[PDB]
Structures are given as structure tokens and as C-alpha cells.
């Protein structure tokens, strides 16, 4: 079996924020994990529900995308961009090729991840097969409906996770946007399915949790550590 | 009811390390929490099993004790020292005076905390009364025998905690010392009583967990955040 990570992206890419900017993939939630997996000698296949994706436009701000990350993002010849060009749909991937399922995010995930049955099945199989399921930021939206095949219960029931904070939605001024669209926060999802939500001290802190082979992180600053943890959890 | 923290110290203070240095209280595990509780307007009472204590001699190293901490430590007129002079034994304290039980550490705790029934009773009452139980570093040794009065089960059973790492004992070259003395590590204690041990990425990282009103931190770098968390958990 090849050393591989399946790196999931949101396929939602519509106008979202009060300034009219689109949500989508939070660039460094894909890029930092991609870099981390590559340093450790893993191949990375990208996947989204539709086989397409767009960038969260607020994630292009220079406090979130700068330096070598920005260079890699602008250079169409970069490994990151060439690999992204090979993005697949769920039916095109083979779950026993993968030891890690890594769910990147951005607010778009709140729209598609809960409904992404096919992606959830794949993640279940990787987990059932001894692999690691990892998610950063709003990535834990994909746990809404994700079943542990061996217990028939929600995978996160009785598990400890972190993820993007309710207080952070408020700071970003998007809570009324979320309510108007009938969306559930990561804390909403954890409570609903009997997971223990373990909060960071501050909403932007590099903070992440390893609960056996279920690995979660809070926000963009946690993307790298969430990737590192997912590798360590393998061994 | 006064706003008060009961700040527990190890009473063990014997030769421990291969260089002949004594273990004891890890100075900043007392001092940083003391400072944090004071900023938030809490009074602090120190307590140990014997009413006495000595300092972990490796915690006086300048990478662990420096700047204003060192000044406060050397100045016998400091609030820290005057309050330490008032250290009590367990029978002398009143548990409904206290909203937080904070267990400082140092390796000495592995000797006395598991056997400190009286301190465990007090912590149980504070918790039973709606308060917070917090422990940093080897502090979770005090959970070995600590019972939730309302369930009759170990307080940490089914809880998520962190604490000093097995890998850290190895880095410090004390694992054979611990074995020879038949001592259990924080990870040993968590496993024995059905707690979920949630590890930091690295053994010296500022890393801490809030599981409802049970708050834990890994090491000296986590002492401040463990204190902050304990206050936030109240509200």
C-alpha cells in the first residue's frame, strides 16, 4: 500500500461575508497540511464533493497568505498547484490507498460537508482500516453524519475534539449570517452527537487534539500541527 | 463566600535526581498560578499534606526561574513569600471558601499526592460544590484515588486530561528512577482509571485542557494557561 493522504476540500464557493466576498477553501488549511505531508514522504490527493473548488476570499488576505505560501500559491508550476490540478471526485478515489483522511476547511464546509455522504463513507473506511481521520477549523462539519462502521454510532460520539470556536464566529461578525442560513457551528455539531468539545484558550491559538486516531485543530494557525498530529497518530 | 483558590503544593522534598538534587515544588507552578489568580482578584491559600514543603532544586535553574519571578522568589517581602509563609495543613482549611482547587507540582507530587486522602476529599467537595479542580504537570498524581462523590467513581473516569508526558520523563533521564521507586506517571494514572490522556505535540509545549470543571496542563510552560483556564471554567 502506497503512503497516501486524501486531503478533502470544500466544494462550496458562493458569496458569504457582509462585504460580498465568497467563502471557499481557506488556502493555508490546504497548503500547510500539503507541505507537512510531503516533508514526511506522503503522496497527496485532493478531493471535493463536486470535483471543483474555489478559494475563501478572506483567506487571501496578507495576514493569512504571505511569504513562501503566497509564492507557492501564485506559481502555477508549484507542486501545490500541479497536485491541485489533479483534484478528484469521491467515486474516483480508492480508500485503502490512504492512511490519513485530512479535512481542510473554510466556512464553505458548513454547507457541503454535513451532506457529503460519499466523503463520509470514505473517511469511515480509512478509519475502519486503522487509519487516521483529521479535520481542522470548520472541517468537523464532516462529522455530522459520519458513522463508525463498527459501532453504528456517530464516529465522534464519546470522542474529544476541537474545531473553530463559537466565540470566533462572533469576532468575525458572521453569527447572524450562519443563523440566517440555518448552519450549525462545530460546537453545535459536537453537542448534537455527544462529542466533548475541548476549547482553546483564545480563538486564534495553535490548538489541536489527538484522540486516538481522531485528530482535530481549531483554525488556520492550527493547520500545520493538525497535520503533524495526524502523522504521529499513525506512527 | 469569599473569592478563593486553594493552591496545593507537594510536601515531598528528598534527593531524587542522579546529580543528587532534591525534588519538591516546581517554583513557577506555584508562582505563575498565584500571580494569575491575584490579577483576577482571588485570594490564595497554600496547602500541603504536612504543612511544609521544599523547592525542586532543578526548578531553580535559570531557564525555569528568572526575571520578575526570580525577584519575587528572592524578596522575602513579596506577596508570594508572605502568602507562602501562611501555608496550611488540610484540616486547617474550609472547602466552601474555595471555588478552585489548583494542584501545583514538581516530581515530588508522585510520592505524596496519590496518598493525600485529605487533600483529595477537599478537592472532591469543591468539585461537588460547583467549583473547579485544576492540576498542572505531575499534579494529576492527585487524581489517583480522587472520587467524584456523586457517582462513586474516580473523578477522572471518562474525563479528558493532560499532564506531564512519558516522553518528557525519558528526556529528563528519570524513567529508571521512577521505576526503581515504583512510581506511576501521569499517563499511567490516566490509563489505570479510564481517563483519556490527550498529549501535547511536544513535551515542553504550553498545552492545557478544559473538560468542564476539570482543567489540566502539561508542564511548567503550561502553568499560567492552566490557571487562566481554571478561572474561565468558573466564569
Swiss-Prot record, chains A, B:
It is an enzyme of class 4 (lyase). It comes from the Eukaryota. It catalyses: methylglyoxal + H2O = (R)-lactate + H(+). The active site is at residues 137-138, 169. Its EC number is 4.2.1.130. Cys-137 is easily oxidized to sulfinic acid. It is found in: Cytoplasm, P-body. Disruption phenotype: Results in higher sensitivity to oxidative stress, reduced thermotolerance, accumulation of higher levels of reactive oxygen species, and reduced chronological life span. GO terms for biological process: cellular response to nutrient levels; cellular response to oxidative stress; chaperone-mediated protein folding; methylglyoxal catabolic process to D-lactate via S-lactoyl-glutathione. GO terms for molecular function: glyoxalase III activity; protein folding chaperone. Belongs to the peptidase C56 family. HSP31-like subfamily. This is Glutathione-independent glyoxalase HSP31.
